[PDB]
Curated annotation (Swiss-Prot), chain B:
Residue ranges, annotated region (Sigma-70 factor domain-3): 317-393
Organism: Escherichia coli (strain K12)
Record protein name field: RNA polymerase sigma factor RpoD
Segment forming the signal sequence: none
DNA-binding region extent: 432-451
Alphabetical list of CDD domains matching this protein: Sigma70_r4
PANTHER family on file: RNA POLYMERASE SIGMA FACTOR RPO, RNA POLYMERASE SIGMA FACTOR RPOD
GO CC annotation: cytosol; cytosolic DNA-directed RNA polymerase complex; sigma factor antagonist complex
Gene name linked to the record: rpoD
Renumbered residue ranges of the record's region Sigma-70 factor domain-2: 238-308
Lineage summary: Bacteria, Pseudomonadati, Pseudomonadota, Gammaproteobacteria, Enterobacterales
Superkingdom of the source species: Bacteria
Subunit structure: Interacts transiently with the RNA polymerase catalytic core formed by RpoA, RpoB, RpoC and RpoZ (2 alpha, 1 beta, 1 beta' and 1 omega subunit) to form the RNA polymerase holoenzyme that can initiate transcription. Identified in a complex containing RpoD, the RNA polymerase subunits RpoA, RpoB and RpoZ, CRP and DNA. Interacts with Rsd; this prevents interaction with the RNA polymerase catalytic core and with promoter DNA, and as a consequence, promotes transcription from promoters that require alternative sigma factors. (Microbial infection) Interacts with Escherichia phage lambda antitermination protein Q.
Curated annotation (Swiss-Prot), chain C:
Lineage: Bacteria, Pseudomonadati, Pseudomonadota, Gammaproteobacteria, Enterobacterales
Free-text function comment from the UniProt entry: DNA-dependent RNA polymerase (RNAP) catalyzes the transcription of DNA into RNA using the four ribonucleoside triphosphates as substrates. Resistance to the antibiotics salinamide A, salinamide B, rifampicin, streptolydigin, CBR703, myxopyronin, and lipiarmycin can result from mutations in this protein.
Domain of life: Bacteria
Summary of subunit composition and partner proteins: The RNAP catalytic core consists of 2 alpha, 1 beta, 1 beta' and 1 omega subunit. When a sigma factor is associated with the core the holoenzyme is formed, which can initiate transcription. The rRNA transcription and antitermination complex (rrnTAC) consists of RNAP, NusA, NusB, NusE (rpsJ), NusG, SubB, ribosomal protein S4, DNA and precursor rRNA; S4 is more flexible than other subunits.
Biotech uses: Co-administration of salinamide and rifampicin or salinamide and myxopyronin suppresses the emergence of resistance to both antibiotics.
PTM comment: Acetylated on several lysine residues in the presence of glucose.
Protein name stated in the entry: DNA-directed RNA polymerase subunit beta'
Positions spanned in the full protein: 253 to 352 of 1407
Swiss-Prot record, chain D:
Subunit structure: The RNAP catalytic core consists of 2 alpha, 1 beta, 1 beta' and 1 omega subunit. When a sigma factor is associated with the core the holoenzyme is formed, which can initiate transcription. The rRNA transcription and antitermination complex (rrnTAC) consists of RNAP, NusA, NusB, NusE (rpsJ), NusG, SubB, ribosomal protein S4, DNA and precursor rRNA; S4 is more flexible than other subunits. In pull-down experiments interacts with CedA.
Biotechnology (record note): Co-administration of salinamide and rifampicin or salinamide and myxopyronin suppresses the emergence of resistance to both antibiotics.
Function field: DNA-dependent RNA polymerase (RNAP) catalyzes the transcription of DNA into RNA using the four ribonucleoside triphosphates as substrates. Resistance to the antibiotics salinamide A, salinamide B, rifampicin, streptolydigin, CBR703, myxopyronin, and lipiarmycin can result from mutations in this protein.
Family membership noted in the UniProt record: Belongs to the RNA polymerase beta chain family.
Origin superkingdom: Bacteria
Protein name, UniProt field: DNA-directed RNA polymerase subunit beta
PTM field: Acetylated on several lysine residues in the presence of glucose.
Transmembrane portions of the chain: none
Portion held of the full protein: 896 to 945 of 1342
Length: 50, 471, 100, 50
């Protein structure tokens, strides 16, 4: 087998779009928002300090 | 936004937001680019030791170990004139280094103004900018770690750091004056006094070889960053304005083996190239210049990354000429053009005509459904030709057995000779000389023994078992 | 495989891998050029599209193949489904020494 | 393979540079050849039978 080095970390469709979206509920965030983020529609505040 | 997942639609919206800049706005932004590049040009002239490498590699070019066009591509208001200007440059620089101890500031300014006339091929711009950037990186890491040493442990205010370190950046007075302030971290600084001061010495060594100080190096390089970033922002605005042109040209080359967006992306890259290389001094609309790149880029990308089995670009041009000629011959002749008729109309000898005709075929997908049957594809038919047939394996085994028995039929040393001369039950077969080495007697007698053994295999009733394997 | 008659036959995975590699290399070049944000964002979206088409093609705009109008088969398609695998080739083989 | 090498050494069997491909009759079908047609590309030398 070979491999390809991706420049931008990419999401695994199976773990996102599978009817129960396991990334979604693992982060307890609805799917609509995650889709909104991956497609560059909105930001998300990761640890916005004080 | 209706959650439209289609990436085409969201790219189109983002593009749609940036409004179209008018006719004069274009000239404005081009002036922005010239002004930024001019600012950075003055700044680079204002830095030293750059002329050192200029003079050095121009001299290299005079000795003829390089090319005259690797530094300049024509000046603005002949090698001889450059040679004399570089001579006066060496003279002015060395004399200003002598007179460094006030007047040298004016002498460096005169050096800069006499150098102003020269331009410099991009590659050297890259070399100089990277040298000064890496010097800034190094200075910044040292300064930041010192400032860390102060604030993270002592909660040290900052005006004091500035005055103590900044202003001189050369004498050791501030280091020990900090310790005179009786602060405890300043007393601990003796632990790394060696490293801090040795890095200060390196700073002085870079300064002297450059022949300046630091605070003004910081000032000049930060102005260079300001100018370059300003110019880049202007270029960003320009390209965002002309994305529409990119799409307009892109819509032409539709499904020709490249996803629409791949086309528009290649067009965006071409537009970047055009913008960065455009000269407004003509007067004519940028769009005219940018097109001549956008079409170029799209065509190049289709040429290279379209086909599965890639074909050189000149071959693609040949095939396109082929298609064109064919079209015309079909409409004139009515029927169709035969390869002979093409060899008439085109100058190739018709051998390359049939070569080009064979080359063009794209591979067919193995999943294509076979006729009137949606449960049997093509992949289910192509067979594996490499696989050896079991019959042949049984034959090879039987032959191995027979040759083993017939070798056992021979004498010991003859059998070893015959086994080693060939590869039976061993790796690579040794030549007569190496088998002789194995026997340590190396000469022709051994070829006599091999041939004698073979002759003994001629004898009937012993070789019949091996005669059988012939067919 | 080279079909008898100078033509070649290829699985669609060759196409999908090629597309992914193309968009990846183009993103590398664009990053090295420091292009405006809009363009890198578009490229990142495209790479997302390509990868997710590779893994399971059909949960998006269904990237169809070159000049054939049929949607090309991704890995998930190879495993899942009747015609594909477990059912077809791992419980439904085709024995030798057999007649009809 | 080695062993075939040895056999050729002994018997001197000049290896034929040509594989067989002839179109033989399918298995278990037997009849009379009623007609034959020959199509040569333009350029190639028509054979006597052509």
């Amino acid at each position: 087998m070979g491999h390809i080095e991706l420049a931008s970390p990419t999401a695994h469709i199976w773990f996102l779009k599978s009817l129960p979206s396991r990334i979604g509920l693992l982060l307890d965030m609805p799917l609509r928002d995650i889709e909104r983020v991956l497609y560059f529609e909105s930001y998300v505040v990761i640890e916005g300090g004080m | 936004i209706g959650r439209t997942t289609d990436p085409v639609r969201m790219y189109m919206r983002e593009m749609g937001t940036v409004e179209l800049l008018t006719r004069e706005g274009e000239i404005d932004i081009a002036k922005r680019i010239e002004d930024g590049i001019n600012q950075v040009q003055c700044s680079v002239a204002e830095y030293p030791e750059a002329i050192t490498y200029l003079l050095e590699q121009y001299d290299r070019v005079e000795a003829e170990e390089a090319r005259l066009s690797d530094l300049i591509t024509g000046f603005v208001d002949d090698p001889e004139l450059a040679r004399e200007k570089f001579a006066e440059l060496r003279a002015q620089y060395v004399v200003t280094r002598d007179t460094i101890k006030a007047t040298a500031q004016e002498e460096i300014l005169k050096l800069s103004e006499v150098f102003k006339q020269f331009r410099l091929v991009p590659k050297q711009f890259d070399y100089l900018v990277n040298s000064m950037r890496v010097m800034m990186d190094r200075v910044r890491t040292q300064e930041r770690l010192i400032m860390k040493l102060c604030v993270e442990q002592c909660k040290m205010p900052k005006k004091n750091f500035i005055t103590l370190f900044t202003g001189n950046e050369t004498s050791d007075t501030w280091f020990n004056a900090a310790i005179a302030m009786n602060k405890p971290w300043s007393e601990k600084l003796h632990d790394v006094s060696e490293e801090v001061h040795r890095a200060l010495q390196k700073l002085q060594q870079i300064e002297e070889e450059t022949g300046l100080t630091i605070e003004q190096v910081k000032d000049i390089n930060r102005r260079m960053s300001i100018g370059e970033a300003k110019a880049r922002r202007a270029k960003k605005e320009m390209v965002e304005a002309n994305l529409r042109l990119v799409i307009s040209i892109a819509k032409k080359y539709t499904n020709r083996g490249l996803q629409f967006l791949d086309l528009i992306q290649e067009g965006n890259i071409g537009l970047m190239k055009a913008v960065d290389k455009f000269e407004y001094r003509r007067g004519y609309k940028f769009s005219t210049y940018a097109t001549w790149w956008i079409r170029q880029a799209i065509t190049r990308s289709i040429a290279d990354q379209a086909r599965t089995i890639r074909i050189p670009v000149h071959m693609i041009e040949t095939i396109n000429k082929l298609n064109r000629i064919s079209r015309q011959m079909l409409q004139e002749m009515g029927r169709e053009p035969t390869p002979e008729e093409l060899a008439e109309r085109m100058l190739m000898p018709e051998d390359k005509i049939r070569k080009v005709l064979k080359i063009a075929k794209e591979p067919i997908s193995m999943e294509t459904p076979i006729g009137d049957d949606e449960d049997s594809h093509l992949g289910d038919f192509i067979e594996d030709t490499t696989l050896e047939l079991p019959l042949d394996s049984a034959t090879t085994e039987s032959l191995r057995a027979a040759t083993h028995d017939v070798l056992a039929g021979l004498t010991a040393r003859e059998a070893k000779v015959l086994r080693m001369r060939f590869g039976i039950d061993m790796n690579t077969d040794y030549t007569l000389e190496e088998v002789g080495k194995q026997f340590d007697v190396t000469r022709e007698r051994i070829r006599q023994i091999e041939a004698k053994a073979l002759r003994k295999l001629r004898h009937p009733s012993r070789s019949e078992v091996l005669r059988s394997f012939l067919d | 495989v080279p079909l008898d008659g100078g033509r070649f036959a290829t699985s669609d995975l060759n196409d999908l891998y090629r597309r992914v590699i193309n968009r990846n290399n183009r993103l590398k070049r664009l990053l090295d050029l420091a292009a405006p944000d809009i363009i890198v964002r578009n490229e990142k979206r495209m790479l997302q599209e390509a990868v997710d088409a590779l893994l399971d093609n059909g949960r998006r705009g269904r990237a169809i193949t070159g000049s054939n109008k049929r949607p090309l088969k991704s890995l998930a398609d190879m495993i899942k489904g009747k015609q594909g695998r477990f059912r077809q080739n791992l419980l439904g083989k085709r024995v030798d020494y057999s007649g009809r | 393979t080695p062993e075939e090498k040895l056999l050729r050494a002994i018997f001197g069997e000049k290896a034929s540079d040509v594989k067989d491909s002839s179109l033989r009759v399918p298995n278990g079908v037997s009849g009379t050849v009623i007609d034959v047609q020959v199509f040569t590309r333009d350029g190639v030398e028509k054979d006597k039978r052509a």
